[PDB]
Scaffold this active site. Structure first.
Site, PDB file in Angstrom:
ATOM      1  N   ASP A 192       5.270  22.589  24.709  1.00  0.00           N
ATOM      2  CA  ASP A 192       5.719  23.022  25.920  1.00  0.00           C
ATOM      3  C   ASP A 192       6.444  21.692  26.523  1.00  0.00           C
ATOM      4  O   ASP A 192       6.616  20.510  25.579  1.00  0.00           O
ATOM      5  CB  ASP A 192       5.537  23.993  26.836  1.00  0.00           C
ATOM      6  CG  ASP A 192       6.854  24.503  27.457  1.00  0.00           C
ATOM      7  OD1 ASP A 192       6.703  24.140  28.828  1.00  0.00           O
ATOM      8  OD2 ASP A 192       6.470  26.134  26.854  1.00  0.00           O
ATOM      9  N   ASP A 193       6.530  21.188  27.603  1.00  0.00           N
ATOM     10  CA  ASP A 193       7.061  20.850  28.430  1.00  0.00           C
ATOM     11  C   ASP A 193       6.481  19.226  28.866  1.00  0.00           C
ATOM     12  O   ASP A 193       5.092  19.267  28.720  1.00  0.00           O
ATOM     13  CB  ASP A 193       7.864  20.462  29.617  1.00  0.00           C
ATOM     14  CG  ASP A 193       8.795  19.610  30.842  1.00  0.00           C
ATOM     15  OD1 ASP A 193       9.124  18.716  29.515  1.00  0.00           O
ATOM     16  OD2 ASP A 193       9.138  19.666  31.915  1.00  0.00           O
ATOM     17  N   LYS A 244      11.981  26.072  22.238  1.00  0.00           N
ATOM     18  CA  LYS A 244      12.459  26.662  23.439  1.00  0.00           C
ATOM     19  C   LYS A 244      13.349  26.061  23.871  1.00  0.00           C
ATOM     20  O   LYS A 244      12.706  24.949  24.121  1.00  0.00           O
ATOM     21  CB  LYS A 244      10.857  27.073  24.102  1.00  0.00           C
ATOM     22  CG  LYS A 244      11.467  26.641  25.275  1.00  0.00           C
ATOM     23  CD  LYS A 244       9.814  27.036  26.048  1.00  0.00           C
ATOM     24  CE  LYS A 244       9.805  28.130  27.392  1.00  0.00           C
ATOM     25  NZ  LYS A 244       7.996  27.881  28.280  1.00  0.00           N
ATOM     26  N   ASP A 268      14.751  25.200  27.255  1.00  0.00           N
ATOM     27  CA  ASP A 268      14.745  25.444  28.675  1.00  0.00           C
ATOM     28  C   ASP A 268      16.265  24.773  29.278  1.00  0.00           C
ATOM     29  O   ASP A 268      16.717  24.383  28.540  1.00  0.00           O
ATOM     30  CB  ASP A 268      13.708  24.768  29.297  1.00  0.00           C
ATOM     31  CG  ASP A 268      13.499  24.666  30.592  1.00  0.00           C
ATOM     32  OD1 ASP A 268      13.898  25.855  30.434  1.00  0.00           O
ATOM     33  OD2 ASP A 268      12.359  24.946  31.370  1.00  0.00           O
ATOM     34  N   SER A 272      16.380  29.976  27.280  1.00  0.00           N
ATOM     35  CA  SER A 272      16.093  30.583  28.836  1.00  0.00           C
ATOM     36  C   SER A 272      17.420  30.798  29.769  1.00  0.00           C
ATOM     37  O   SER A 272      17.168  30.978  30.682  1.00  0.00           O
ATOM     38  CB  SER A 272      14.972  29.118  29.793  1.00  0.00           C
ATOM     39  OG  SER A 272      14.240  29.007  28.570  1.00  0.00           O
ATOM     40  N   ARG A 325      14.457  34.377  27.486  1.00  0.00           N
ATOM     41  CA  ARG A 325      13.246  34.279  29.038  1.00  0.00           C
ATOM     42  C   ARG A 325      14.380  35.026  30.249  1.00  0.00           C
ATOM     43  O   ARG A 325      15.287  33.955  30.611  1.00  0.00           O
ATOM     44  CB  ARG A 325      12.910  33.355  29.567  1.00  0.00           C
ATOM     45  CG  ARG A 325      11.873  32.839  29.091  1.00  0.00           C
ATOM     46  CD  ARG A 325      10.182  32.921  29.726  1.00  0.00           C
ATOM     47  NE  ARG A 325      10.781  33.179  30.867  1.00  0.00           N
ATOM     48  CZ  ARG A 325       9.827  32.243  31.656  1.00  0.00           C
ATOM     49  NH1 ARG A 325       9.719  30.487  30.624  1.00  0.00           N
ATOM     50  NH2 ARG A 325      10.308  32.025  32.838  1.00  0.00           N
ATOM     51  N   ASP A 338       9.015  31.954  36.295  1.00  0.00           N
ATOM     52  CA  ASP A 338       8.289  31.355  35.542  1.00  0.00           C
ATOM     53  C   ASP A 338       6.505  32.918  35.446  1.00  0.00           C
ATOM     54  O   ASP A 338       6.799  32.693  36.957  1.00  0.00           O
ATOM     55  CB  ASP A 338       7.674  30.425  35.622  1.00  0.00           C
ATOM     56  CG  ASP A 338       8.274  28.733  34.900  1.00  0.00           C
ATOM     57  OD1 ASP A 338      10.086  30.115  34.603  1.00  0.00           O
ATOM     58  OD2 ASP A 338       8.069  27.920  35.332  1.00  0.00           O
TER      59      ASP A 338
HETATM   60  O1  LIG Z   1       8.128  22.238  32.682  1.00  0.00           O
HETATM   61  C1  LIG Z   1       8.013  22.935  31.431  1.00  0.00           C
HETATM   62  C2  LIG Z   1       8.787  24.519  32.779  1.00  0.00           C
HETATM   63  O2  LIG Z   1       9.759  24.770  32.402  1.00  0.00           O
HETATM   64  C3  LIG Z   1      10.375  25.422  33.357  1.00  0.00           C
HETATM   65  O3  LIG Z   1      10.157  26.461  34.410  1.00  0.00           O
HETATM   66  C4  LIG Z   1      10.243  27.166  32.746  1.00  0.00           C
HETATM   67  O4  LIG Z   1      10.333  28.453  32.459  1.00  0.00           O
HETATM   68  C5  LIG Z   1       8.118  27.523  31.666  1.00  0.00           C
HETATM   69  O5  LIG Z   1       8.296  28.316  30.532  1.00  0.00           O
HETATM   70  C6  LIG Z   1       7.879  25.811  31.607  1.00  0.00           C
HETATM   71  O6  LIG Z   1       8.270  25.147  30.115  1.00  0.00           O
HETATM   72  O1  LIG Z   2      14.208  24.940  38.262  1.00  0.00           O
HETATM   73  C1  LIG Z   2      13.076  25.990  37.921  1.00  0.00           C
HETATM   74  C2  LIG Z   2      12.909  27.206  37.131  1.00  0.00           C
HETATM   75  O2  LIG Z   2      12.107  27.828  36.231  1.00  0.00           O
HETATM   76  C3  LIG Z   2      12.497  29.098  35.378  1.00  0.00           C
HETATM   77  O3  LIG Z   2      13.576  28.407  34.245  1.00  0.00           O
HETATM   78  C4  LIG Z   2      13.246  30.363  36.136  1.00  0.00           C
HETATM   79  O4  LIG Z   2      13.249  31.449  35.723  1.00  0.00           O
HETATM   80  C5  LIG Z   2      14.436  29.778  37.121  1.00  0.00           C
HETATM   81  O5  LIG Z   2      14.627  30.537  37.830  1.00  0.00           O
HETATM   82  C6  LIG Z   2      14.017  28.302  37.598  1.00  0.00           C
HETATM   83  O6  LIG Z   2      12.557  28.594  39.104  1.00  0.00           O
END
Ligand SMILES: OC[C@H]1O[C@H](O)[C@H](O)[C@@H](O)[C@H]1O
Ligand SMILES: OC[C@H]1O[C@H](O)[C@H](O)[C@@H](O)[C@H]1O
Ligand SMILES: *[C@@H]1O[C@H](CO)[C@@H](O[C@@H]2O[C@H](CO)[C@@H](O[C@@H]3O[C@H](CO[C@H]4O[C@H](CO)[C@@H](O)[C@H](O)[C@@H]4O)[C@@H](O)[C@H](O[C@H]4O[C@H](CO)[C@@H](O)[C@H](O)[C@@H]4O)[C@@H]3O)[C@H](O)[C@H]2NC(C)=O)[C@H](O)[C@H]1NC(C)=O
Ligand SMILES: *[C@@H]1O[C@H](CO)[C@@H](O[C@@H]2O[C@H](CO)[C@@H](O[C@@H]3O[C@H](CO[C@H]4O[C@H](CO)[C@@H](O)[C@H](O)[C@@H]4O)[C@@H](O)[C@H](O[C@H]4O[C@H](CO)[C@@H](O)[C@H](O)[C@@H]4O)[C@@H]3O)[C@H](O)[C@H]2NC(C)=O)[C@H](O)[C@H]1NC(C)=O
Ligand SMILES: *[C@@H]1O[C@H](CO[C@@H]2O[C@@H](C)[C@@H](O)[C@@H](O)[C@@H]2O)[C@@H](O[C@@H]2O[C@H](CO)[C@@H](O[C@@H]3O[C@H](CO)[C@@H](O)[C@H](O)[C@@H]3O)[C@H](O)[C@H]2NC(C)=O)[C@H](O)[C@H]1NC(C)=O
Ligand SMILES: *[C@@H]1O[C@H](CO[C@@H]2O[C@@H](C)[C@@H](O)[C@@H](O)[C@@H]2O)[C@@H](O[C@@H]2O[C@H](CO)[C@@H](O)[C@H](O)[C@H]2NC(C)=O)[C@H](O)[C@H]1NC(C)=O
Ligand SMILES: *[C@@H]1O[C@H](CO)[C@@H](O)[C@H](O)[C@H]1NC(C)=O
Ligand SMILES: *[C@@H]1O[C@H](CO)[C@@H](O)[C@H](O)[C@H]1NC(C)=O
Ligand SMILES: OC[C@H]1O[C@H](O)[C@H](O)[C@@H](O)[C@H]1O
Ligand SMILES: OC[C@H]1O[C@H](O)[C@H](O)[C@@H](O)[C@H]1O
Lengths: 387, 387
Positions: free
Chosen positions: A61-62, A137, A139, A171, A196, A200
Site C-alpha cells: 500500500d502507501d 491499487k 488511489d 478508488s 472502493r 476507509d
Molecule cells: O495512505 C493510504 C490510504 O489512502 C486512502 O485513505 C485509502 O482509501 C486507504 O485504503 C489507504 O490506501
Molecule cells: O482524503 C482521504 C480519502 O480516503 C478515502 O479514499 C476515503 O474514501 C475518502 O472519503 C477520503 O477520506
C-alpha cells in the site's frame, strides 16, 4: 474490466489497515513498511495454508515510494526496499503468489509520497509491468474530479497496452460520494476490476457497521453492478486485529462473503491466533465467496427485534443465508421459515451451518426453524435443494 | 450513606446485562432468571476464586417477582423460585456471599413487574430485611419526579428503620439527567451507597465509550462527590460477554478501576474464559479499585494523537495511571514523562504495569518513557515512590 482477471473476488493480504505508514525501521524494524515485512508475510502465506485456500495476492500500500529518477521513473525507498520491487515480485512469484502495488492518481499519495499525475500514467504503468506486478491499487488523493475522470480510464488503457495482465483496483468512486449521478457504475465496470465505493475501514465494530449500513442503504444501486471481473470493495477484513470481538470477526467474514466482497486481510500473519485463522480459512465460507456466478447478495429482511437476514444466490440453485443480530443484549432465538424468507414452493432444502458444520435437513418452505444468534454476531447457512 | 457499608466500591455479580428478562425456563432452563441460575453462579463465585478476590455480592435484577400476596407482601415467581428468597439468601450466605435484590420506585419495574409504590416502600423494605437481603437496587421506571423525590429518601429511611445493614443502590439521578441543578449529589451521598448517574450499558464498545465520555465531560461535578460509602455507578462490566475484544475488555476494567467504580460483573461464570477470568481476578487491579482512600480518578491529559491519560490518587502516596488509546489504526508508541503528567517534586518513582507485571524503575519527573498502547486499549501503571 474485460482483462480475464478476477472472475471471482480477489483474495489476499494488504499492508495498510494493520501497518499503515510506519517507516521507522530503526525503532520498529519488524513492523515498518519494508522489503522484510512483505517477504515475511509471503513466507506465512506460502507455509501456513493461506495460498492453498485461495489467498494469493500480497499487496503493498502507501509509503513504499522513494522518489523518481532522472528519467522520471518511480523508485522504492532505497533503505526500506534495498533490492527493489522486481526482487520482491520475483520472490513472491517463486512462492506461487501475486504482488500488488499502490499508486495515486494525483499530485501525491494520501500520505504525501510522489503521485502518478496524468503525464506519468503511461510511464508508471510500464514500470509496474516491467517489475512484473500483478495488481494496482490506484488511489485518488490530491486530484480534481476532471483529473480522475481522465486518469482512471487512461491508466486502464496504459496497463492493457503493456500486455501484462494486471488487476485494477480503483478508488475513483470513493472520492465522488460513491453514488449516481456523480459515479457512473457501467463506466467503472468497463475500466476497473474492483472499486472502493466508500470510507476507509478502521479497526472498530462501529466502522464495520458504518460501511455495512451504507452498502445496505444503497443496495438497489450497488448489488446489480457487481459480477465476475468487476466487484464492489467495502475494504479490508479486520479479522486478527484489535477492534473486533470473536462474534464480530465471524460477522464481518460472513457479511463480506454474502456481499461478494474481496477477502483482503490486513493483519500480522506472524502472530495470528488459531481462532482467527479458522475464520479466514473456513473452506465453505471461501467456497461461497468464490462462487462462479459472482452474484452479490442483498439484505432481504429486517425485524424490529433487530435481526437482519441477508441472502446470496449461488451456483447449482444453492443459497447463502446470513442471520445477523444488531442486538446488544444477549443471544437471541430467531424463529422463522424459508417461506417467510421468500423461497419457492414444493422444493425441500438442506442447510449446512457454515461455522459449526451442523446439518439441518428436510426444510420445506413451511418448516419452522430456530437459529440462536449471539449479539453483534451471525448464523450463516449454506442452503441447497435435496432430491 | 452512613450505614457502615461499601467503604470501598462493591464487587460482585449482577444478572441483568447478560441474562436480561429471560423467563422462558421451558425452552431455556439453564439461562432463565431462576433460583437455579443464582445458585449455580453462587457456586462458581465460591469455588473459582471470585469470593476470595472480593466478589461478594450476588444480585438479582428485574423479572424475579411473582406478585403480591393477600397482605400485599412481595413474592418471587413460584415456578422459577420454588424454594423462596429466604432459601436463596441462606444458600448465598452459607457460601460466604451476599444477596442483592431489585425493586422499582414507581408503578411497575421497567419490565412491567409489580412496582414498589410510595405506600409499599416500608412493607417492601421490611420484607427484604426479613429475607436477609444485603443489597437493594431501586430503579425509577413508571414514576414522576415528585414520586422519586419522595420515594428514594423514604426507602433509605425505611431500610435504616429495619435495623439490617442493606447496601442501597439508587437510579434516581439517571432519571433526572444525572446533573445539577436537577440532581442534588449532596442529598444522594447521604441517602445512597451508590447511584446510577447515566445510561444503561449495552454489550458494545460504543456503549462503553459513550458512558466514559459522559463521565469525563462532567468530571468536575462527578469526581468530588464519590468516596467511601457513596459511589458513582457507570453500570456493569462487560468482560466475558460478546461485544468487547480483548483490548477493550482490558480497557473497561482499567478505566472502571481509575473511576473508583463498582466492579459488578454480568456474565456467565460457568463458561467464562481463562483470559477474561485473568482480567477480572487481577490482584493489583482489584487492590487499586479497592483503595481505602476511595478517591475517584480523572482524565488528566488528552492529545491530538487520541491518547488519553487518566490518574487516580491512591493510599501511601501511590498513583494509578491509565494510558488509553482511542485510535483505531495500530499500536502506538506514546512518549511522555511524569513531569508532563503534572507530577511535582524531586521524588523518584517506580511503576508496575498492572497487566504485564513488568517493573519500570528510576522514574524521575524529567525521565522520558515510552509505552506501547494497542488501539481501543490501555497500558496501566501502579506508580509509587521509592527511597
Ligand atoms: O495512505 C493510504 C490510504 O489512502 C486512502 O485513505 C485509502 O482509501 C486507504 O485504503 C489507504 O490506501
Ligand atoms: O482524503 C482521504 C480519502 O480516503 C478515502 O479514499 C476515503 O474514501 C475518502 O472519503 C477520503 O477520506
Ligand atoms: C486488453 O484489452 C483487451 C480488449 O478489452 C482484452 O481482450 C479481451 O480479453 C477478454 C478476456 O480474455 C476476451 O473475452 C473472452 O472472449 C472469448 C471469445 O470471444 C471471441 O469472440 C468475440 C465475438 O463473439 C470477439 O469479440 C473476440 O475477439 C473473440 O474472438 C470468450 O469465449 C470468453 O468467454 C469467457 O466468459 C464466458 C462468459 O462469461 C465464460 O463462459 C467462459 O468461461 C470464459 O471465461 C471471454 O468473453 C475478449 O474477447 C478480449 N477482447 C478482444 C477485443 O480481444 C485483453 O485481455 C486486455 N489485455 C490485457 C493485457 O489486459
Ligand atoms: C441508620 O442511620 C444512622 C445514621 O443516621 C446509622 O448510624 C451510623 O452508623 C455508622 C456505621 O455503623 C456509624 O459509624 C461508625 O462509628 C463508630 C463510632 O464513631 C462514633 O464516635 C465518634 C467520636 O469521634 C463520633 O464522631 C461518631 O459520631 C460516632 O458516635 C466507628 O467505630 C466506626 O468506624 C468504622 O470505620 C473505621 C474507618 O476509619 C474503621 O476503623 C472501623 O473498623 C469501623 O468500621 C464507624 O465510623 C455512625 O457513627 C452512625 N451514625 C450515627 C449518627 O449514629 C445507622 O447505621 C443506620 N442504620 C442502618 C441499619 O442502616
Ligand atoms: C498539483 O501540482 C501542480 C504543479 O505545481 C507543483 O506543485 C505545487 C503544489 C507547487 O509546489 C509548485 O511549486 C509545483 O510546481 C499545482 O499547480 C501549481 O499550484 C501552485 C500552488 O497552488 C501554484 O502556485 C501558486 O500561484 C498562486 C497564484 O494563483 C499564488 O497565490 C500561490 O502563492 C502559489 O505561488 C502554481 O501556479 C501551479 N502551477 C502550475 C504549473 O499549474 C496544482 O495546484 C496541484 N493540483 C492539485 C489538484 O493539487
Ligand atoms: C402510576 O399509576 C397511577 C395509578 O393509576 C393507575 O393507572 C390508571 C391509568 C388506572 O389504570 C388505575 O386503575 C391505576 O391505579 C397513575 O395515576 C393515575 O393516572 C391516570 C392517568 O392515566 C389518572 O386517570 C388517575 O387520576 C391517576 N390516579 C391517581 C388517583 O393518582 C399514574 O399516572 C402512574 N404514574 C406514571 C408516571 O405512570
Ligand atoms: C410454525 O410455528 C408457529 C408458531 O409461531 C405456528 O403457529 C405454525 O403453525 C407453525 N407452522 C407449521 C406449518 O408448523
Ligand atoms: C526527553 O525527550 C526529549 C525529546 O523528545 C529531549 O529533548 C529531552 O532531552 C529528553 N529529556 C531527558 C531528561 O532526557
Ligand atoms: O428492567 C431492568 C433494567 O431497568 C433499568 O433500565 C436499569 O437501568 C437497568 O440496569 C436494569 O435494571
Ligand atoms: O428505563 C430505562 C432507564 O435507563 C437509564 O437509567 C436512563 O438514564 C433512564 O432515563 C431510563 O431510560
Amino acid at each position: 474490466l474485460d482483462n480475464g482477471l478476477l472472475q471471482t473476488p480477489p483474495m489476499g493480504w494488504l499492508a495498510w489497515e494493520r501497518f499503515r505508514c510506519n517507516i521507522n525501521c530503526d525503532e520498529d524494524p519488524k513492523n515498518c513498511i519494508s522489503e522484510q515485512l512483505f517477504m515475511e508475510m509471503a513466507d506465512r502465506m506460502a507455509q501456513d495454508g493461506w495460498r492453498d485456500m485461495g489467498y494469493t495476492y500480497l499487496n503493498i500500500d502507501d509509503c513504499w515510494i522513494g522518489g523518481r529518477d532522472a528519467s522520471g521513473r518511480l523508485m522504492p525507498d532505497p533503505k526500506r526496499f534495498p533490492h527493489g520491487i522486481p526482487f520482491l515480485a520475483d520472490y513472491v512469484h517463486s512462492l506461487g503468489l501475486k504482488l500488488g502495488i499502490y499508486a495515486d492518481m494525483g499530485n501525491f499519495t494520501c500520505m504525501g509520497y510522489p503521485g502518478t499525475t496524468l503525464d506519468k500514467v503511461v510511464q508508471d504503468a510500464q514500470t509496474f509491468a516491467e517489475w512484473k506486478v500483478d495488481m494496482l491499487k490506484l488511489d485518488g488523493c490530491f486530484s480534481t474530479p476532471e483529473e480522475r475522470a481522465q486518469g482512471y480510464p487512461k491508466m486502464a488503457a496504459a496497463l492493457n497496452a503493456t500486455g501484462r495482465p494486471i488487476a485494477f483496483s480503483c478508488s475513483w468512486p470513493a472520492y465522488e460520494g460513491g453514488l449516481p449521478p456523480r459515479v457512473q457504475y457501467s463506466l467503472l465496470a468497463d475500466i476497473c476490476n474492483l472499486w472502493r465505493n466508500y470510507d476507509d475501514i478502521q479497526d472498530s465494530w462501529w466502522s464495520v457497521l458504518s460501511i455495512l449500513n451504507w452498502f445496505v442503504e444503497h443496495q438497489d444501486i450497488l448489488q446489480p453492478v457487481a459480477g465476475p471481473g468487476h466487484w464492489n470493495d467495502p475494504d479490508m477484513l479486520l479479522i486478527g486485529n484489535f477492534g473486533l470481538s470473536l462474534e464480530q470477526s465471524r460477522a464481518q467474514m460472513a457479511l463480506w462473503t454474502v456481499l461478494a466482497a474481496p477477502l483482503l486481510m490486513s493483519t500480522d500473519l506472524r502472530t495470528i491466533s488459531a481462532q482467527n485463522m479458522d475464520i479466514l480459512q473456513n473452506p465453505l465460507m471461501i467456497k461461497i465467496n468464490q462462487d462462479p456466478l459472482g452474484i452479490q447478495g442483498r439484505r432481504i429482511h429486517k425485524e424490529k427485534s433487530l435481526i437482519e437476514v441477508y441472502m446470496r444466490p449461488l451456483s447449482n440453485k444453492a443459497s447463502a443465508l446470513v442471520f445477523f443480530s444488531c442486538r446488544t443484549d444477549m443471544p437471541y432465538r430467531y424463529h422463522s421459515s424459508l417461506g417467510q424468507l421468500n423461497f419457492t414452493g414444493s422444493v425441500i432444502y438442506e442447510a449446512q451451518d457454515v461455522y459449526s458444520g451442523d446439518i439441518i435437513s428436510g426444510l420445506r418452505d413451511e418448516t419452522n426453524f430456530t437459529v440462536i444468534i449471539n449479539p453483534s454476531g451471525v448464523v450463516m447457512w449454506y442452503l441447497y435443494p435435496i432430491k
